[PDB]
Amino acid sequence: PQITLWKRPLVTIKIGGQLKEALLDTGADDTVIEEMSLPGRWKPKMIGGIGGFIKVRQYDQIIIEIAGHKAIGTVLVGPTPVNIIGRNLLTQIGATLNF
Amino acid sequence: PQITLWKRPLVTIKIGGQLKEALLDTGADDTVIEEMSLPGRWKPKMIGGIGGFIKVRQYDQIIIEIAGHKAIGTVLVGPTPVNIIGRNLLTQIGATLNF
Ligand SMILES: Cc1coc(CN(C)C(=O)c2cccc(C(=O)N[C@@H](Cc3ccccc3)[C@H](O)CN(CC(C)C)S(=O)(=O)c3ccc(CO)cc3)c2)n1
Ligand SMILES: [Cl-]
Ligand SMILES: [Cl-]
Ligand SMILES: [Cl-]
Ligand code: NA
Ligand code: NA
């Protein structure tokens, strides 16, 4: 699809068996999801943005379905105010910015 | 152009006669630039990023070139990890996300 930027680029994702709404976010290196359980190993990480840093759990090799496209990669889980699909998964679905 | 996302989508902007680097950021409603001098009056705004809220200075109707495209619109000045071009100016330059 071509997604307009008149509105926030929110899509439906499926992760860990759960449906969520998330932003397609070219400004985020990595994907960050609000608190949820994921299977397997994780390690702690600090990620920062406007307002400072939050602590997250880094889970590697997690499958997401993003607007119907499957992608695998790292997912950071923690107290983000919005679910963010970052570049590590945007690349895998072939997303580009065009103007 | 068509910009893939394997790297950060950094571009050159020109504001106040000065070249700066900025990140094309579809996850931001607004454009936020590091401390600099801009003409005119400003208004207060709070923005809630990933780590909490910051105060910024809102300047409206500012001339800014983005990757060689001319825009005129609102620029928020305050402490951000990187200059970010949000949807208010991505729409002015005709940007969309595509997959
Ligand atoms: C989606 C939505 C909810 O309410 C809002 C309003 N709002 C605060 C904005 O539109 C707004 C305005 C100006 C800047 C930002 C803003 O900072 N947006 C971020 C995504 C994001 C969206 C909403 C809340 C929190 C974080 C941004 O797109 C991604 N961010 C990095 C950027 C600042 C270099 S980040 O969220 O801090 C971030 C994401 C991922 C990592 C791990 O690589 C590290 C940091 C967002 N939008
Ligand atoms: Cl990854
Ligand atoms: Cl590609
Ligand atoms: Cl504007
Ligand atoms: Na894993
Ligand atoms: Na003004």
Side-chain angles (χ1 to χ4, degrees), chain B residues 35-91:
Chain B
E35 181 57 42
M36 66 173 298
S37 159
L38 291 171
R41 289 187 60 82
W42 60 276
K43 288 172 317 181
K45 194 187 173 58
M46 300 290 304
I47 56 177
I50 202 170
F53 283 82
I54 64 168
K55 297 186 169 191
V56 297
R57 303 198 307 280
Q58 177 175 325
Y59 294 85
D60 294 324
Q61 210 165 323
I62 294 301
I63 295 165
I64 172 173
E65 204 174 83
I66 301 156
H69 290 251
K70 275 214 174 167
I72 308 181
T74 296
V75 171
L76 308 180
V77 177
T80 164
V82 67
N83 293 327
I84 53 173
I85 308 305
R87 296 188 295 101
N88 73 306
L89 300 184
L90 294 171
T91 55

Tab-separated table of all heavy atoms in Angstrom, chain B residues 35-91:
chain	number	residue	atom	x	y	z
B	35	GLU	N	18.462	23.421	19.994
B	35	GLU	CA	18.569	24.863	20.291
B	35	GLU	C	19.187	25.660	19.184
B	35	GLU	O	20.276	25.313	18.691
B	35	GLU	CB	19.431	25.062	21.557
B	35	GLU	CG	19.581	26.535	21.943
B	35	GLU	CD	18.240	27.226	22.163
B	35	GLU	OE1	17.362	26.583	22.783
B	35	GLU	OE2	18.092	28.410	21.758
B	36	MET	N	18.520	26.698	18.734
B	36	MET	CA	19.040	27.609	17.714
B	36	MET	C	18.146	28.831	17.806
B	36	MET	O	17.070	28.844	18.446
B	36	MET	CB	19.003	27.039	16.287
B	36	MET	CG	17.540	26.854	15.850
B	36	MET	SD	17.469	26.372	14.099
B	36	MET	CE	18.208	27.827	13.383
B	37	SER	N	18.615	29.875	17.146
B	37	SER	CA	17.888	31.124	17.141
B	37	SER	C	16.933	31.176	15.955
B	37	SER	O	17.379	30.929	14.829
B	37	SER	CB	18.903	32.287	17.062
B	37	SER	OG	18.208	33.408	16.576
B	38	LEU	N	15.675	31.496	16.181
B	38	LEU	CA	14.716	31.684	15.089
B	38	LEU	C	13.999	33.022	15.312
B	38	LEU	O	13.891	33.485	16.448
B	38	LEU	CB	13.662	30.583	15.011
B	38	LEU	CG	14.195	29.200	14.584
B	38	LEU	CD1	13.119	28.142	14.761
B	38	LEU	CD2	14.722	29.202	13.129
B	39	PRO	N	13.547	33.602	14.205
B	39	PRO	CA	12.894	34.897	14.322
B	39	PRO	C	11.460	34.802	14.807
B	39	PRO	O	10.799	33.762	14.656
B	39	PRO	CB	12.855	35.375	12.842
B	39	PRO	CG	12.739	34.080	12.072
B	39	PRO	CD	13.650	33.112	12.809
B	40	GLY	N	10.981	35.914	15.346
B	40	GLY	CA	9.567	36.042	15.701
B	40	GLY	C	9.279	35.599	17.133
B	40	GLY	O	10.144	35.352	17.977
B	41	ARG	N	7.978	35.495	17.379
B	41	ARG	CA	7.491	35.057	18.694
B	41	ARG	C	7.381	33.545	18.721
B	41	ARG	O	7.229	32.881	17.696
B	41	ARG	CB	6.136	35.699	18.975
B	41	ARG	CG	6.345	37.220	19.247
B	41	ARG	CD	5.078	37.867	19.680
B	41	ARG	NE	4.488	37.340	20.907
B	41	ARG	CZ	4.849	37.683	22.143
B	41	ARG	NH1	5.850	38.535	22.335
B	41	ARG	NH2	4.193	37.148	23.151
B	42	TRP	N	7.442	33.012	19.929
B	42	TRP	CA	7.223	31.582	20.127
B	42	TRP	C	6.137	31.393	21.172
B	42	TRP	O	5.835	32.313	21.956
B	42	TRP	CB	8.513	30.870	20.500
B	42	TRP	CG	9.195	31.333	21.779
B	42	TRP	CD1	10.032	32.376	21.907
B	42	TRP	CD2	9.082	30.732	23.073
B	42	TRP	NE1	10.468	32.489	23.214
B	42	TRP	CE2	9.886	31.476	23.951
B	42	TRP	CE3	8.366	29.627	23.576
B	42	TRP	CZ2	10.000	31.150	25.317
B	42	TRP	CZ3	8.453	29.266	24.916
B	42	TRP	CH2	9.275	30.041	25.760
B	43	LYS	N	5.578	30.194	21.142
B	43	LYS	CA	4.516	29.749	22.038
B	43	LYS	C	4.974	28.492	22.752
B	43	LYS	O	5.815	27.746	22.220
B	43	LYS	CB	3.225	29.448	21.280
B	43	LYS	CG	2.476	30.660	20.755
B	43	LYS	CD	1.319	30.310	19.841
B	43	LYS	CE	1.568	29.228	18.816
B	43	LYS	NZ	0.389	28.955	17.931
B	44	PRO	N	4.433	28.176	23.911
B	44	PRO	CA	4.892	26.987	24.605
B	44	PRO	C	4.204	25.741	24.098
B	44	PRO	O	3.049	25.718	23.663
B	44	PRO	CB	4.411	27.256	26.050
B	44	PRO	CG	3.155	28.031	25.835
B	44	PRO	CD	3.452	28.953	24.679
B	45	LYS	N	4.942	24.627	24.165
B	45	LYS	CA	4.369	23.329	23.865
B	45	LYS	C	5.101	22.278	24.686
B	45	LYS	O	6.312	22.396	24.923
B	45	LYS	CB	4.475	23.072	22.359
B	45	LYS	CG	3.608	21.890	21.905
B	45	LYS	CD	3.851	21.552	20.447
B	45	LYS	CE	3.114	20.271	20.090
B	45	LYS	NZ	1.651	20.418	20.355
B	46	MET	N	4.372	21.275	25.127
B	46	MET	CA	4.883	20.086	25.770
B	46	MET	C	4.830	18.907	24.813
B	46	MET	O	3.794	18.704	24.179
B	46	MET	CB	4.026	19.685	26.997
B	46	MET	CG	3.971	20.738	28.075
B	46	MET	SD	5.570	20.888	28.904
B	46	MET	CE	5.871	19.224	29.479
B	47	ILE	N	5.949	18.167	24.735
B	47	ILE	CA	5.788	16.945	23.907
B	47	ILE	C	6.330	15.764	24.716
B	47	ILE	O	7.352	15.804	25.419
B	47	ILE	CB	6.450	17.133	22.548
B	47	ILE	CG1	7.930	17.508	22.669
B	47	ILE	CG2	5.680	18.136	21.697
B	47	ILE	CD1	8.605	17.623	21.310
B	48	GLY	N	5.558	14.697	24.631
B	48	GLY	CA	5.776	13.462	25.386
B	48	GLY	C	6.484	12.512	24.445
B	48	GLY	O	5.912	11.901	23.552
B	49	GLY	N	7.778	12.333	24.606
B	49	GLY	CA	8.500	11.359	23.805
B	49	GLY	C	8.630	10.062	24.592
B	49	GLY	O	7.974	9.749	25.604
B	50	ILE	N	9.563	9.240	24.145
B	50	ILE	CA	9.621	7.883	24.686
B	50	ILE	C	10.025	7.928	26.144
B	50	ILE	O	9.564	7.041	26.897
B	50	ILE	CB	10.567	6.992	23.869
B	50	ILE	CG1	10.220	5.515	24.080
B	50	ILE	CG2	12.019	7.336	24.158
B	50	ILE	CD1	10.953	4.580	23.130
B	51	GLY	N	10.833	8.899	26.577
B	51	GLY	CA	11.294	8.862	27.989
B	51	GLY	C	10.587	9.831	28.912
B	51	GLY	O	10.887	9.829	30.117
B	52	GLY	N	9.643	10.588	28.406
B	52	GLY	CA	8.921	11.565	29.263
B	52	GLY	C	8.676	12.834	28.489
B	52	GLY	O	8.908	12.883	27.293
B	53	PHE	N	8.161	13.845	29.172
B	53	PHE	CA	7.790	15.111	28.563
B	53	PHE	C	8.896	16.145	28.575
B	53	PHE	O	9.607	16.225	29.590
B	53	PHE	CB	6.572	15.685	29.344
B	53	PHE	CG	5.326	14.925	28.904
B	53	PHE	CD1	5.047	13.697	29.482
B	53	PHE	CD2	4.516	15.460	27.917
B	53	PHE	CE1	3.939	12.983	29.059
B	53	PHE	CE2	3.409	14.747	27.501
B	53	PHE	CZ	3.124	13.513	28.064
B	54	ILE	N	8.987	16.922	27.505
B	54	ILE	CA	9.898	18.073	27.527
B	54	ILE	C	9.091	19.305	27.147
B	54	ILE	O	8.077	19.191	26.436
B	54	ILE	CB	11.099	17.927	26.570
B	54	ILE	CG1	10.646	17.867	25.113
B	54	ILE	CG2	11.993	16.735	26.944
B	54	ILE	CD1	11.782	18.017	24.116
B	55	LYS	N	9.575	20.457	27.574
B	55	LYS	CA	9.107	21.738	27.040
B	55	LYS	C	9.903	22.138	25.816
B	55	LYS	O	11.137	21.987	25.800
B	55	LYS	CB	9.232	22.892	28.055
B	55	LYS	CG	8.373	22.695	29.290
B	55	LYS	CD	8.398	23.917	30.194
B	55	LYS	CE	7.373	23.910	31.317
B	55	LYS	NZ	7.272	25.229	31.995
B	56	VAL	N	9.216	22.683	24.815
B	56	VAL	CA	9.903	23.212	23.637
B	56	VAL	C	9.343	24.601	23.336
B	56	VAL	O	8.282	24.952	23.894
B	56	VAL	CB	9.732	22.291	22.412
B	56	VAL	CG1	10.375	20.937	22.715
B	56	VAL	CG2	8.256	22.197	22.035
B	57	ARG	N	10.019	25.311	22.455
B	57	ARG	CA	9.561	26.589	21.948
B	57	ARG	C	8.924	26.382	20.578
B	57	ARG	O	9.622	25.856	19.699
B	57	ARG	CB	10.707	27.596	21.847
B	57	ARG	CG	11.388	27.788	23.191
B	57	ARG	CD	12.201	29.050	23.210
B	57	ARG	NE	13.173	29.225	22.129
B	57	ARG	CZ	14.377	28.658	22.088
B	57	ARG	NH1	14.813	27.814	23.040
B	57	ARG	NH2	15.191	28.913	21.065
B	58	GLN	N	7.652	26.762	20.398
B	58	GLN	CA	7.038	26.575	19.105
B	58	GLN	C	7.109	27.846	18.289
B	58	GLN	O	6.558	28.872	18.715
B	58	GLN	CB	5.564	26.193	19.338
B	58	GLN	CG	4.850	26.053	18.015
B	58	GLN	CD	3.426	25.563	18.201
B	58	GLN	OE1	3.074	24.774	19.072
B	58	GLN	NE2	2.542	25.986	17.322
B	59	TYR	N	7.730	27.761	17.112
B	59	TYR	CA	7.807	28.876	16.164
B	59	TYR	C	6.971	28.474	14.955
B	59	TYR	O	7.161	27.405	14.373
B	59	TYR	CB	9.252	29.133	15.737
B	59	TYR	CG	10.160	29.619	16.830
B	59	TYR	CD1	10.784	28.705	17.674
B	59	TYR	CD2	10.426	31.002	16.984
B	59	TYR	CE1	11.629	29.167	18.680
B	59	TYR	CE2	11.274	31.445	18.001
B	59	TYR	CZ	11.865	30.521	18.839
B	59	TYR	OH	12.743	30.899	19.844
B	60	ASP	N	6.046	29.330	14.556
B	60	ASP	CA	5.225	29.001	13.408
B	60	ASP	C	5.734	29.705	12.147
B	60	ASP	O	6.428	30.728	12.205
B	60	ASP	CB	3.800	29.453	13.703
B	60	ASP	CG	3.187	28.647	14.842
B	60	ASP	OD1	3.473	27.448	14.937
B	60	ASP	OD2	2.378	29.205	15.605
B	61	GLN	N	5.364	29.138	11.002
B	61	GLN	CA	5.545	29.733	9.684
B	61	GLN	C	7.033	30.012	9.441
B	61	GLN	O	7.404	31.092	8.960
B	61	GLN	CB	4.632	30.951	9.559
B	61	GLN	CG	4.194	31.166	8.116
B	61	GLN	CD	3.019	32.132	8.041
B	61	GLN	OE1	2.127	32.137	8.880
B	61	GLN	NE2	2.999	32.957	6.996
B	62	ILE	N	7.891	29.020	9.769
B	62	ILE	CA	9.346	29.140	9.558
B	62	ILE	C	9.737	28.528	8.233
B	62	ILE	O	9.291	27.415	7.871
B	62	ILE	CB	10.046	28.391	10.703
B	62	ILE	CG1	9.815	29.040	12.093
B	62	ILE	CG2	11.545	28.270	10.440
B	62	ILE	CD1	10.317	30.496	12.167
B	63	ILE	N	10.565	29.192	7.456
B	63	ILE	CA	11.084	28.692	6.180
B	63	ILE	C	12.152	27.645	6.438
B	63	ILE	O	13.108	27.892	7.134
B	63	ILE	CB	11.600	29.856	5.326
B	63	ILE	CG1	10.434	30.790	4.941
B	63	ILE	CG2	12.300	29.316	4.084
B	63	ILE	CD1	10.994	32.128	4.426
B	64	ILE	N	11.962	26.460	5.845
B	64	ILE	CA	12.913	25.391	6.078
B	64	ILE	C	12.982	24.559	4.813
B	64	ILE	O	11.935	24.193	4.270
B	64	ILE	CB	12.554	24.568	7.341
B	64	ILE	CG1	13.450	23.318	7.454
B	64	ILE	CG2	11.083	24.141	7.401
B	64	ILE	CD1	13.261	22.561	8.752
B	65	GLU	N	14.187	24.234	4.343
B	65	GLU	CA	14.326	23.345	3.183
B	65	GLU	C	14.682	21.959	3.702
B	65	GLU	O	15.525	21.850	4.635
B	65	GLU	CB	15.424	23.879	2.246
B	65	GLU	CG	15.403	23.490	0.779
B	65	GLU	CD	16.513	24.258	0.045
B	65	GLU	OE1	17.716	23.869	0.039
B	65	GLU	OE2	16.177	25.314	-0.548
B	66	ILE	N	14.077	20.934	3.122
B	66	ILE	CA	14.278	19.560	3.594
B	66	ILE	C	14.684	18.707	2.396
B	66	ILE	O	13.831	18.562	1.510
B	66	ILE	CB	13.010	18.997	4.258
B	66	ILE	CG1	12.593	19.869	5.472
B	66	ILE	CG2	13.182	17.547	4.636
B	66	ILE	CD1	11.138	19.760	5.803
B	67	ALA	N	15.913	18.221	2.377
B	67	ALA	CA	16.366	17.414	1.245
B	67	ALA	C	16.103	18.145	-0.049
B	67	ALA	O	15.723	17.515	-1.030
B	67	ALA	CB	15.699	16.035	1.263
B	68	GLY	N	16.269	19.461	-0.081
B	68	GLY	CA	16.087	20.224	-1.305
B	68	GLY	C	14.652	20.610	-1.627
B	68	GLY	O	14.403	21.234	-2.678
B	69	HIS	N	13.715	20.266	-0.748
B	69	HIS	CA	12.305	20.624	-0.929
B	69	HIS	C	11.926	21.767	0.005
B	69	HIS	O	12.246	21.667	1.179
B	69	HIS	CB	11.374	19.430	-0.620
B	69	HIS	CG	11.526	18.384	-1.678
B	69	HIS	ND1	10.529	18.138	-2.612
B	69	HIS	CD2	12.555	17.568	-1.968
B	69	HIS	CE1	10.959	17.184	-3.431
B	69	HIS	NE2	12.197	16.814	-3.071
B	70	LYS	N	11.266	22.781	-0.512
B	70	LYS	CA	10.890	23.914	0.329
B	70	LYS	C	9.607	23.687	1.123
B	70	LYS	O	8.600	23.259	0.581
B	70	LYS	CB	10.728	25.150	-0.574
B	70	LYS	CG	12.036	25.886	-0.835
B	70	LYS	CD	11.889	27.404	-0.967
B	70	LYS	CE	13.206	28.146	-1.094
B	70	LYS	NZ	13.154	29.573	-1.521
B	71	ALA	N	9.706	24.022	2.410
B	71	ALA	CA	8.580	23.954	3.333
B	71	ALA	C	8.495	25.254	4.142
B	71	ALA	O	9.513	25.943	4.273
B	71	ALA	CB	8.699	22.770	4.260
B	72	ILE	N	7.321	25.552	4.662
B	72	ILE	CA	7.144	26.719	5.537
B	72	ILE	C	6.159	26.260	6.604
B	72	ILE	O	4.997	25.985	6.296
B	72	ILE	CB	6.603	27.971	4.826
B	72	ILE	CG1	7.419	28.319	3.584
B	72	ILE	CG2	6.626	29.121	5.826
B	72	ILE	CD1	6.911	29.569	2.867
B	73	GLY	N	6.633	26.139	7.858
B	73	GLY	CA	5.675	25.620	8.838
B	73	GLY	C	6.253	25.632	10.226
B	73	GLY	O	7.236	26.362	10.481
B	74	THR	N	5.657	24.848	11.102
B	74	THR	CA	6.005	24.948	12.518
B	74	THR	C	7.257	24.156	12.884
B	74	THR	O	7.382	22.977	12.483
B	74	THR	CB	4.817	24.461	13.360
B	74	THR	OG1	3.706	25.352	13.125
B	74	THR	CG2	5.109	24.463	14.857
B	75	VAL	N	8.135	24.790	13.620
B	75	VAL	CA	9.345	24.149	14.078
B	75	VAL	C	9.364	24.284	15.580
B	75	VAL	O	9.223	25.395	16.093
B	75	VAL	CB	10.579	24.812	13.445
B	75	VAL	CG1	11.840	24.268	14.095
B	75	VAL	CG2	10.549	24.585	11.921
B	76	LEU	N	9.562	23.173	16.266
B	76	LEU	CA	9.702	23.141	17.712
B	76	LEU	C	11.207	23.097	18.063
B	76	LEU	O	11.964	22.328	17.484
B	76	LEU	CB	8.986	21.929	18.319
B	76	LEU	CG	7.521	21.717	17.915
B	76	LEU	CD1	6.983	20.476	18.624
B	76	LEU	CD2	6.646	22.936	18.224
B	77	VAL	N	11.650	23.952	18.982
B	77	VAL	CA	13.057	24.004	19.379
B	77	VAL	C	13.190	23.505	20.796
B	77	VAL	O	12.517	24.068	21.678
B	77	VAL	CB	13.591	25.448	19.244
B	77	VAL	CG1	15.052	25.514	19.737
B	77	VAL	CG2	13.502	25.903	17.803
B	78	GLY	N	14.033	22.506	21.015
B	78	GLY	CA	14.222	22.023	22.405
B	78	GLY	C	15.226	20.850	22.394
B	78	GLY	O	15.805	20.537	21.351
B	79	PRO	N	15.435	20.162	23.516
B	79	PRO	CA	16.490	19.144	23.614
B	79	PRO	C	16.147	17.769	23.116
B	79	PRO	O	15.651	16.911	23.798
B	79	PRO	CB	16.718	19.086	25.139
B	79	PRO	CG	15.348	19.376	25.707
B	79	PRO	CD	14.719	20.396	24.798
B	80	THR	N	16.464	17.424	21.885
B	80	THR	CA	16.115	16.145	21.308
B	80	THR	C	17.402	15.400	20.943
B	80	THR	O	18.372	16.093	20.631
B	80	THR	CB	15.214	16.355	20.074
B	80	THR	OG1	15.179	15.152	19.311
B	80	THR	CG2	15.786	17.427	19.164
B	81	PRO	N	17.469	14.074	20.971
B	81	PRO	CA	18.720	13.383	20.673
B	81	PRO	C	19.215	13.699	19.275
B	81	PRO	O	20.394	13.536	19.025
B	81	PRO	CB	18.373	11.892	20.694
B	81	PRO	CG	16.882	11.892	20.548
B	81	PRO	CD	16.404	13.112	21.304
B	82	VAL	N	18.340	14.083	18.370
B	82	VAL	CA	18.659	14.369	16.970
B	82	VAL	C	17.549	15.258	16.414
B	82	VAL	O	16.392	15.223	16.861
B	82	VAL	CB	18.807	13.105	16.102
B	82	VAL	CG1	17.450	12.416	15.977
B	82	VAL	CG2	19.381	13.429	14.735
B	83	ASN	N	17.860	16.074	15.428
B	83	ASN	CA	16.844	16.887	14.790
B	83	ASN	C	15.896	15.938	14.053
B	83	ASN	O	16.392	15.039	13.327
B	83	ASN	CB	17.512	17.793	13.772
B	83	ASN	CG	18.414	18.840	14.354
B	83	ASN	OD1	18.170	19.351	15.463
B	83	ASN	ND2	19.463	19.161	13.625
B	84	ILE	N	14.587	16.117	14.245
B	84	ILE	CA	13.625	15.212	13.621
B	84	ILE	C	12.643	15.998	12.781
B	84	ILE	O	12.112	17.039	13.190
B	84	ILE	CB	12.896	14.342	14.679
B	84	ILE	CG1	12.256	15.120	15.775
B	84	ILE	CG2	13.840	13.278	15.245
B	84	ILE	CD1	11.388	14.284	16.726
B	85	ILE	N	12.418	15.518	11.557
B	85	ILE	CA	11.414	16.095	10.662
B	85	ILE	C	10.155	15.260	10.796
B	85	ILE	O	10.177	14.079	10.395
B	85	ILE	CB	11.924	16.143	9.216
B	85	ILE	CG1	13.299	16.809	9.092
B	85	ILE	CG2	10.820	16.771	8.349
B	85	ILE	CD1	13.336	18.218	9.702
B	86	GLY	N	9.108	15.822	11.406
B	86	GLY	CA	7.885	15.124	11.616
B	86	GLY	C	6.865	15.315	10.530
B	86	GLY	O	7.116	15.954	9.503
B	87	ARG	N	5.649	14.747	10.737
B	87	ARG	CA	4.672	14.665	9.664
B	87	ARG	C	4.211	16.042	9.248
B	87	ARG	O	3.838	16.175	8.059
B	87	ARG	CB	3.473	13.774	10.026
B	87	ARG	CG	3.900	12.328	10.229
B	87	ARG	CD	2.622	11.408	10.397
B	87	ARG	NE	1.930	11.810	11.642
B	87	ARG	CZ	0.835	12.587	11.690
B	87	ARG	NH1	0.233	13.042	10.540
B	87	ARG	NH2	0.322	12.916	12.864
B	88	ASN	N	4.253	17.061	10.112
B	88	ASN	CA	3.794	18.362	9.637
B	88	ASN	C	4.612	18.863	8.461
B	88	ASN	O	4.038	19.570	7.604
B	88	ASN	CB	3.832	19.382	10.795
B	88	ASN	CG	5.235	19.816	11.173
B	88	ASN	OD1	6.105	18.966	11.455
B	88	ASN	ND2	5.456	21.136	11.189
B	89	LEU	N	5.896	18.531	8.376
B	89	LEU	CA	6.684	18.950	7.203
B	89	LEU	C	6.895	17.805	6.231
B	89	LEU	O	7.079	18.086	5.046
B	89	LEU	CB	8.034	19.515	7.683
B	89	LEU	CG	7.896	20.731	8.610
B	89	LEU	CD1	9.285	21.310	8.968
B	89	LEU	CD2	7.018	21.836	8.034
B	90	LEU	N	6.844	16.534	6.647
B	90	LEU	CA	6.895	15.464	5.660
B	90	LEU	C	5.712	15.587	4.694
B	90	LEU	O	5.835	15.285	3.490
B	90	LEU	CB	6.860	14.107	6.348
B	90	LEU	CG	8.075	13.765	7.212
B	90	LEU	CD1	7.842	12.482	8.019
B	90	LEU	CD2	9.333	13.630	6.360
B	91	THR	N	4.547	16.019	5.181
B	91	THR	CA	3.440	16.175	4.240
B	91	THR	C	3.724	17.317	3.270
B	91	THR	O	3.335	17.232	2.088
B	91	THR	CB	2.090	16.422	4.966
B	91	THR	OG1	2.222	17.544	5.828
B	91	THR	CG2	1.737	15.144	5.748
